[PDB]
Design an enzyme around this catalytic site. Sequence first.
Site, short mmCIF file in Angstrom:
data_model
loop_
_atom_site.label_atom_id
_atom_site.label_comp_id
_atom_site.label_asym_id
_atom_site.label_seq_id
_atom_site.Cartn_x
_atom_site.Cartn_y
_atom_site.Cartn_z
N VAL A 1 3.22 -1.94 -9.57
CA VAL A 1 4.22 -3.02 -9.71
C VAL A 1 3.34 -4.12 -10.67
O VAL A 1 2.47 -4.52 -10.47
CB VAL A 1 4.86 -3.88 -8.54
CG1 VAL A 1 5.05 -5.26 -8.71
CG2 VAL A 1 6.16 -3.01 -8.06
N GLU B 1 -0.11 2.99 2.41
CA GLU B 1 -0.14 4.09 1.98
C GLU B 1 1.02 5.08 2.22
O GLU B 1 1.70 4.96 3.47
CB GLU B 1 -1.32 4.95 2.56
CG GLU B 1 -2.80 4.37 2.39
CD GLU B 1 -3.18 4.46 0.95
OE1 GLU B 1 -3.44 3.52 0.36
OE2 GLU B 1 -3.60 5.84 0.58
N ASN C 1 -2.01 -3.67 -8.78
CA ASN C 1 -0.92 -5.00 -8.99
C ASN C 1 -1.57 -5.99 -9.63
O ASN C 1 -0.89 -7.06 -9.58
CB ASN C 1 -0.55 -5.09 -7.43
CG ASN C 1 0.18 -4.01 -7.04
OD1 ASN C 1 -0.30 -3.28 -5.58
ND2 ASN C 1 0.95 -3.24 -7.50
N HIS D 1 2.29 1.67 -3.16
CA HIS D 1 2.36 1.04 -1.91
C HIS D 1 3.50 0.29 -1.62
O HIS D 1 4.02 -0.43 -2.33
CB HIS D 1 1.27 0.16 -1.81
CG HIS D 1 -0.08 0.37 -1.67
ND1 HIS D 1 -0.50 1.68 -1.20
CD2 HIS D 1 -1.34 -0.03 -2.34
CE1 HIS D 1 -1.71 2.01 -1.28
NE2 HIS D 1 -2.28 0.91 -1.98
N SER E 1 -0.08 -1.12 -4.36
CA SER E 1 -0.37 0.25 -5.08
C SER E 1 -1.61 0.19 -6.10
O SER E 1 -2.01 -0.80 -6.54
CB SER E 1 0.98 0.67 -6.01
OG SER E 1 2.06 0.44 -5.31
O1 LIG Z 1 6.43 1.87 -8.67
C1 LIG Z 1 6.83 2.19 -7.42
O2 LIG Z 1 7.34 3.22 -7.07
C2 LIG Z 1 6.98 0.79 -6.77
C3 LIG Z 1 5.57 0.68 -5.94
C4 LIG Z 1 4.52 -0.29 -6.73
C5 LIG Z 1 4.25 -1.76 -6.19
O3 LIG Z 1 4.63 -2.26 -5.12
O4 LIG Z 1 2.87 -2.07 -6.49
#
Ligand SMILES: O=C(O)CCCC(=O)O
Lengths: 520, 152
Positions: free
Chosen positions: A70, A455, A244, A23, A1
């Site tokens: 995340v 994506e 991330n 992501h 993400s």
């Molecule tokens: O916050 C979310 O909707 C999960 C995706 C974030 C990731 O996996 O980096």
Amino acid sequence: SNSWAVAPGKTANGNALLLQNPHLSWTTDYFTYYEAHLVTPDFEIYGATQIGLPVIRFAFNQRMGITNTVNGMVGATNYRLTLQDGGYLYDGQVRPFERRQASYRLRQADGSTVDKPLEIRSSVHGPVFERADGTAVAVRVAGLDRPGMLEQYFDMITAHSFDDYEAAMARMQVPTFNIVYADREGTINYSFNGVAPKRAEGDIAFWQGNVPGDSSRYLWTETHPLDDLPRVTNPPGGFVQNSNDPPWTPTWPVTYCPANHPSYLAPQTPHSLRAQQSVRLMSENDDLTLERFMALQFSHRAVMADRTLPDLIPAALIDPDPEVQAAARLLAAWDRDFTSDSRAALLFEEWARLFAGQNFAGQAAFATPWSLDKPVSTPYGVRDPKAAVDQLRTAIANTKRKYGAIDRPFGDASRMILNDVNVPGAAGYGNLGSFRVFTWSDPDENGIRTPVHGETWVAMIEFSTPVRAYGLMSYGNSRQPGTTHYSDQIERVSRADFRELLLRREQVEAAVQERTPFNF
Amino acid sequence: QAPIAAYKPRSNEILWDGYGVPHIYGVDAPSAFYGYGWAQARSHGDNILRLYGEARGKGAEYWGPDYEQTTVWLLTNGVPERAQQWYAQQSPDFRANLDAFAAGINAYAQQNPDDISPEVRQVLPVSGADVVAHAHRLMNFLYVASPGRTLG
Ligand SMILES: O=C(O)CCCC(=O)O
């Protein structure tokens, strides 16, 4: 993400900019995002969220907007228990377990349901499970007493100012995630959010493993307030970001460093190449427009190539195997970008899988190790070019086996296929440096592969007045059998042709295809 | 200077655009949540109901073996019961929005029984606590504490 927030001073029109770029798996059901727009006399919210959530996690409206990545907040602890005499050893004495005899029904192949016994043992730590190897583990999850997760998100996204927004976040009801904010007032913010147990010792790695469950010494009971967590607001750089990567390069120049926080909050590991591209794309550009901002999101640079090819190529060219030589020339001519027509991309990947492991995160093979002092230019070079060439030798075999040739066009093997829509792929693995991400699956018997994750919901918003926003959902807005809204967006994704998100009533009324009146 | 005037919806309706994106307009919060729940049942009803079913710790009961591990994981961690508590601990206002959301899903299934997959019909009707349960499972027992890290 990925997540980006640009301050007015760093843009051309003077309005904040925000990127929502989570992501997740394209197939796991509870990870499917949904796009919606809610309007009542007192609030408006537009955005995506996981199916089943009554609140929009990735939202924006005419005043503000947020996004999530995340951060892996270590909000739970797995304790290794020392079983002894029907109980478990704790602080020198044998403590008894809490035991509750529960049960549940298991559906049978014939339609009936058998009643199955389920015993639930708990230690002072929490519920106990027995791993396949025989290890008795007790899991203690922090924040089990925070029932306001859904309402916090609801209050955060309907906030009338950054102040109210923070106040909502301060309730500590959302247990995890990095969260980025931006509004029409000009404020941008990054927050390493989550419910973190207060501990007096041990780094994150210690708490990520099996903590000894035989001493009150490791039994935490309190959690950190929002003010103990890494955060950034309006930094000098004019932007915040997170891909991330650990919270140590949320902006440039930084506003803090690892030493400023307890060592169990986040890791201090090398930032992925995608994360580095992220910091470069923002800091290196000024006077951004919504269009330029969008264009930057499409970045699909094989950063791994820039870090290794200068050393690999010369070494390969001296190898006796003529095919290794040809592979070296093929890779040498490559512009190092994951485009549909790249005849070198697939080959580079295969070598990368060996040079840096299957996930592409391995660090052991670089000549210059990663360093927080040069966060976007390390690691660099090939440590053992001779070995690397052998790895290339093996990669050539692997590429021919998987795709049928060492120079197959990337977009011919990489496809985005939904229902009967089959379009050419571009961009790729984030760990190789590609910002826009498509985690391609292993290929099938014909060398065809599709996105397994990457994506999903992608939107870029400019907080002008009125706001202007564009977005796309890879797998459409529905997965119900027979729906026409599953494969109707992937063709546009293949051309990065984004839809303008419609927030204004007049715009909505112009595009309406179905009216569903209702009454509650 | 000041944001563009907000829209004052005078009736509850969903305006769907060409891509299946629902624009839910409600005269009040509960109405909008109901509309949101209806839209979601329309676009992802089958998987939502299935997931909600799992959150009740009824996975093994409703669909057998393939869902038994998760059921054990959620029951042992008392997720479905804690969901009941959390639901009860919601502020009256928000609990009303959650009830509305579940009502919207139930309503859609009611008016469009043919759009709901047979296997997940037994889940209905869903309740506000179900909405709380799932969210509680997704945040704390998937993201934060995954069954993989505990069991290995
Ligand atoms: O916050 C979310 O909707 C999960 C995706 C974030 C990731 O996996 O980096």
